[PDB]
Symmetry: D2
């Protein structure tokens, strides 16, 4: 009986369904797939990319950037929600082909540096090509690119380095506060008494209070279904989207119900 | 007028004064200098080293390890308080000559990986040879070597990755709770409104409460004067040493007096 | 038409067939699989491991090390032929669970650091968890562990960092020169005019002359079929094994026949 | 008798004497100091920087780049001759402030990654802030930026990763072949029987033949005195500059005279 073969990280086909650039505000665009969020922000001095999705999406992300008049050498900065394969997948290839830099916290950097291997909960089951972080950011640090200021808010839980980003864009002159908040889920996580994450419950609770107080008028998430976005319907994509308090309150009730069944 | 020459990190001569191994408990020893703490813990499966001091102390640390019957290949683990040159200096050379591994958190790892360069407060003024961290530890994670369990307690402030360590040793059969707590000082730090550390005051305050609640019967610090240790007097080294509440309360009063003068 | 799913690196089942430790000489053992070579060398000061095979073989390698009386904390050094997933797979997990160090050249280190991703010929198709190299070795450098000296011989071609290792063991007192030489194959490689490897043909030719002059009495390869070893037959495993000149001459004829068909 | 203090890497004041941009050809400029070469190449798609000199020269290099109409976000690529502190010093700070990427071979990358520490000949005596290499280049690989193609030629010896660069510029329409070749010196090196560099003499000899065959009409070196450049005299800077054969022949005679005195 020989050892088993390696298994590939397979996702639902909807996660890999390419879509044309969808406009969120005057400067923010969705260039990912139907169920994976990859936000592009066009500024006067370059473009910022938030997440990239699965690792095989680098060619698609470059296509949509070309459609917005953004050359590869115009991507200046890559920001991440958390360093998982379905969000930070193409960061390695995107760095080689665009000349951009990556800014993330220490926890996201060390997870990104080892390609998501040795995950606290998944181990080596979900591995993507590694990439280095050129700039280390702290909680509440302001990253400015082309006049648009990005503020990081640490919300650990899903991963230790889970970071929420906030920035102010315009909607035909009217300012709008956007908040790209990370996932607040714990799929298959051992919450209570985890030797690899001893203070996980504390971090999750404190993160719920963090996203409740986020300066937010329009909320987006790495998985658009978590914030009730519908990238397929285009114009009405932000129709039934949730607030920050609602998304936090909904996630916390699921965390307590999950924690309760774990003590059984 | 040519550009200035580089300046070397010079310390007081007392920091570099070698001393013979001083016994703290049945398994814990001080093998550093008179004013720099480097703790060695002998176990049945190997030895653990906490800090190393200045980078030019690797030869001295190996001498004292040889005196305790510890071969270079017997050092199994290196733990750090924070990745500064006067504490984590010889970690690079100690790894090459002992075959040991380093365990630190993400913030200490990224600071250790770039050799203390690009410090949040000191910049490139205090640079030491870089070294990689083989194991990443979380807050409250238990690291066991030879039956002795080391528990990490995150106390950020002096550095983002400042970690306090606790373990239980014996004093001729009687158990003793030891707590090696990091420095709680902010020398020349801009505390209020620091763009490189926006939540520094919050982290400092929460760290004072962390060291107050540390399970501690005997307290040691990277600088022994901070906890009123006197490594010169040998037997009476722990005579006038401070408690955890006293060391925290003394450091917090200095933090508030420093914060008050900063708003002036 | 959504983007395709990721494909897993699948190998022949014979590559993953566990086998009991096979004795090569007084100190050298085969602890890998039937068709993947993982050499263990027991010394008075510890054990050296050459290669590990596929990444899912860490548990098997530890089992055979336990059978030879080698505890996890007794593995002191890991040496590699080249940093590919079917040879350097478990190096990341083996470092975390044994406390060993890795010694490889610069080319093998940078390939090992990015987990085999961005291969010069395979791209991201063959990815394994990354690992760092603690010691950098040069061509002809001697690495000594427990009295047994390992000499590295650079033989680039299959990978830029392909390294052959030589050491002298005994066969019941009689000395024997062992040479673990890397693969001299180019499967699917574009040999002529490769923009990612412009001097590949020169490196391959110079490597044939390198393995011809290797001090060798018994030859082993990462794939035992390349040197006509038969790990299944146990005692007669080295029966029809090839010399160094024969293995080089056989590989060079295949390289020229491959280069000839490429110019057609 | 306490341990000695750390010593700072001090150089001659002429090495740190800032100078205004000196024109080499239609696109190549000297923006370093009087005795340290830092070449800037302006293209239609950005600027390439070859070397940076001492680490405290980042502010000066940015000043001269601003004088040539080159914004910080216009530096796209950094190329190195070898990763020593007097050539690769400011690469870390230049990456943080310009958003550029670094391209170097594996040997230069691993030396650049550890900040020049653990030098094969100097140890930890000459340490600069570390920096990562975003792209790994092979011998003879072509790097194109804005139509100008840079070809790397490995010439190991001074350092294992010593790389010479060649590119074709114009002199008011007339093409000119420029060759920026590394230093061919061995200051204080143990040449014969070096355990850290066993094949050093072979690499030095093969490097002399490499620079002799370099496609070169105008030669420059990291130290301009090595190729008889005089950056002070401005217009007549290339007056008495040497050819490639002359610079190689002069360096080889010094290598043999140095090797002869070593065997005495
Ligand atoms: C690592 O990627 C994830 N996990 C998986 O794909 C498998 C392994 C799983 O469900 O256990 C993960 O975390 N995600 C999230 C999230 O909310 O971030 C959700 C909801 C589930 O999908 C991705
Ligand atoms: C980086 O090393 C330190 N700083 C210096 O040496 C100079 C630069 C300084 O005083 O500003 C630093 O922090 N230390 C501590 C500590 O408590 O940790 C104290 C009390 C002061 O000494 C060391
Ligand atoms: C990356 O691993 C290899 N390649 C593959 O598995 C597939 C991708 C392939 O054949 O192209 C590779 O190289 N090997 C060797 C070797 O001789 O080293 C041989 C003979 C073939 O198997 C492994
Ligand atoms: C590490 O920097 C160098 N060495 C020194 O500065 C001291 C340490 C020394 O001379 O031994 C080094 O190599 N250089 C070269 C070169 O040709 O590259 C020459 C000629 C000498 O200066 C620099
Ligand atoms: Zn996830
Ligand atoms: Zn996810
Ligand atoms: Zn300090
Ligand atoms: Zn200190
Ligand atoms: Zn291979
Ligand atoms: Zn193979
Ligand atoms: Zn040099
Ligand atoms: Zn030099």
């Amino acid at each position: 009986a020989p050892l088993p073969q390696l298994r590939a990280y397979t996702v639902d086909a909807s996660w890999l369904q390419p879509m044309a650039p969808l406009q969120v505000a005057d400067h923010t665009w969705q260039i990912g797939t139907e169920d994976l969020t990859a936000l592009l922000v066009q500024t006067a001095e370059g473009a910022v990319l938030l997440d990239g999705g699965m690792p095989q999406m680098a060619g698609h992300l470059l296509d949509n950037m070309k459609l917005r008049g953004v050359a590869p050498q115009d991507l200046r900065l890559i920001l991440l929600s958390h360093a998982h394969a379905d969000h930070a997948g193409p960061v390695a290839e995107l760095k080689r082909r665009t000349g951009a830099h990556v800014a993330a916290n220490a926890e996201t950097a060390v997870l990104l540096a080892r390609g998501g291997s040795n995950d606290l909960h998944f181990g080596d089951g979900i591995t993507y090509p590694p990439a280095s972080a050129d700039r280390i950011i702290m909680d509440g640090e302001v990253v400015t690119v082309g006049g648009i200021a990005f503020t990081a808010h640490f919300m650990p839980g899903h991963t230790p380095g889970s970071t929420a980003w906030t920035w102010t864009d315009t909607r035909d002159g009217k300012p709008v506060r956007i908040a790209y908040a990370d996932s607040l889920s714990a799929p298959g996580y051992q919450l209570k008494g985890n030797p690899r994450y001893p203070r996980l419950i504390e971090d999750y609770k404190r993160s719920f209070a963090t996203v409740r107080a986020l300066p937010c008028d329009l909320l987006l998430t790495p998985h658009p279904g978590a914030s009730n976005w519908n990238y397929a319907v285009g114009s009405k994509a932000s129709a039934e989207a949730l607030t920050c308090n609602a998304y936090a309150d909904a996630a916390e009730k699921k965390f307590d119900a999950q924690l309760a069944r774990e003590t059984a």
